[PDB]
Amino acid sequence: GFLELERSSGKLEWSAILQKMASDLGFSKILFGLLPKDSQDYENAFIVGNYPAAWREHYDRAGYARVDPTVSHCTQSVLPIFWEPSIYQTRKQHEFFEEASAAGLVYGLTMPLHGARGELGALSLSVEAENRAEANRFMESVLPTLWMLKDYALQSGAGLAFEH
Amino acid sequence: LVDGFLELERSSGKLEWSAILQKMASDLGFSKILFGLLPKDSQDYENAFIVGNYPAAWREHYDRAGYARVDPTVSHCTQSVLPIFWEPSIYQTRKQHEFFEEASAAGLVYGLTMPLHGARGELGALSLSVEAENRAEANRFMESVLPTLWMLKDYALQSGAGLAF
Ligand SMILES: COc1ccccc1C(=O)Oc1c(Br)cc(Br)cc1CNC(=O)c1ccccc1[N+](=O)[O-]
Ligand SMILES: COc1ccccc1C(=O)Oc1c(Br)cc(Br)cc1CNC(=O)c1ccccc1[N+](=O)[O-]
Numbered sequence: 001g002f003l004e005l006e007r008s009s010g011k012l013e014w015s016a017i018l019q020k021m022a023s024d025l026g027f028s029k030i031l032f033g034l035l036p037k038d039s040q041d042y043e044n045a046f047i048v049g050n051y052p053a054a055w056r057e058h059y060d061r062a063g064y065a066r067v068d069p070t071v072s073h074c075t076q077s078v079l080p081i082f083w084e085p086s087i088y089q090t091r092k093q094h095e096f097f098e099e100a101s102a103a104g105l106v107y108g109l110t111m112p113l114h115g116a117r118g119e120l121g122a123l124s125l126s127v128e129a130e131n132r133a134e135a136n137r138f139m140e141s142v143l144p145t146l147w148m149l150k151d152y153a154l155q156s157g158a159g160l161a162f163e164h
Numbered sequence: 165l166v167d168g169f170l171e172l173e174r175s176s177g178k179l180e181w182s183a184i185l186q187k188m189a190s191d192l193g194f195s196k197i198l199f200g201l202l203p204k205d206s207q208d209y210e211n212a213f214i215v216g217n218y219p220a221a222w223r224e225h226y227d228r229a230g231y232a233r234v235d236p237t238v239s240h241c242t243q244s245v246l247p248i249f250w251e252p253s254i255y256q257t258r259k260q261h262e263f264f265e266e267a268s269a270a271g272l273v274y275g276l277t278m279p280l281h282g283a284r285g286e287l288g289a290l291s292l293s294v295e296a297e298n299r300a301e302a303n304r305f306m307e308s309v310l311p312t313l314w315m316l317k318d319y320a321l322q323s324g325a326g327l328a329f
Pocket of ligand 1: 034035045055071074105121124
């Protein structure tokens with residue numbers, strides 16, 4: 001639980017616990033990103049997780065926070081956004097989909113994080129699967145548990161990220 | 165839920181939105197609800213956007229007694245995205261004990277409050293009361309529906325922000 005996240009000491013232990021919870025839910029890859037109130041500085045977000053480091057670096061270098069459609073979505077909504085063909089509309093967004101798929105990140109969802117002190121973030125989780133249909137079933141069967149998890153991760157994470 | 169969300173989105177205005185949300189809560193097992201929402205950087209609880217079916221006299225009293233300064237769920241909501249259950253432990257001060265007695269007298273004895281923190285800085289709460297024989301039976305019931313309610317509150321927030329502002 002959150003209890004586990006709260007008792008942990010430091011960022012390494014907290015990332016290992018979150019990765020495990022997410023793995024227990026069927027997601028082998030995650031990225032928890034968090035910004036303080038009023039910040040839009042995506043290249044200096046507090047980040048936890050196990051996305052391939054080269055993909056994280058590429059995301060930063062290419063400035064993909066400008067193109068990633070889950071980014072504009074999180075600024076407008078508290079609801080999850082599933083990684084579906086229909087969210088990638090522009091040339092640049094299709095390149096995005098293609099580079100992210102080359103990293104293994106093809107199916108998944110992004111849960112926006114909106115903290116009590118105005119923190120802005122996302123918990124993105126990717127699921128390994130044969131097609132869209134299978135990925136959807138796996139994501140749907142755990143969605144109530146993920147929906148709680150994202151809020152526990154935010155409440156715990158905000159303190160990890162910003163309390164020094 | 166997603167059906168409910170679209171119904172909320174497709175609703176005509178506050179009256180139909182309130183009726184839909186009330187019934188979602190009722191179908192899930194909760195008798196009374198209160199959905200409250202403030203815009204970014206407001207602490208004017210007396211003039212929040214409010215939906216629901218708490219007794220009118222109770223709502224009036226809460227406003228006249230300045231209970232937004234007392235109600236322990238209000239401080240809680242400004243500090244967390246996690247639910248606060250209406251446990252004896254949350255009423256710490258003398259004034260909070262009086263608050264509990266008055267809410268209880270209104271029928272509002274067991275329940276929980278889900279903080280709402282919107283994408284544009286909206287601050288709110290979805291509070292739901294449950295009718296039950298005693299606390300242990302209420303808590304059993306709340307634990308069985310909590311994952312559904314957790315989803316519900318975010319749907320209600322996102323739609324409600326759209327209606328209110
Ligand atoms: C504070 O942080 C944020 C705040 C509001 C929103 C996002 C965030 C964030 O964390 O954004 C990032 C950052 Br920064 C780096 C990387 Br790498 C990835 C993301 C988020 N996007 C994805 O994970 C995504 C989404 C869809 C398909 C594939 C992917 N994917 O990347 O594979
Ligand atoms: C924008 O609105 C808000 C914004 C951030 C937080 C709360 C709110 C809100 O809606 O606060 C209110 C308001 Br305003 C009026 C009334 Br009446 C009730 C509440 C909420 N409190 C309860 O429902 C509650 C809680 C525990 C025991 C009994 C009760 N109870 O009242 O029976």
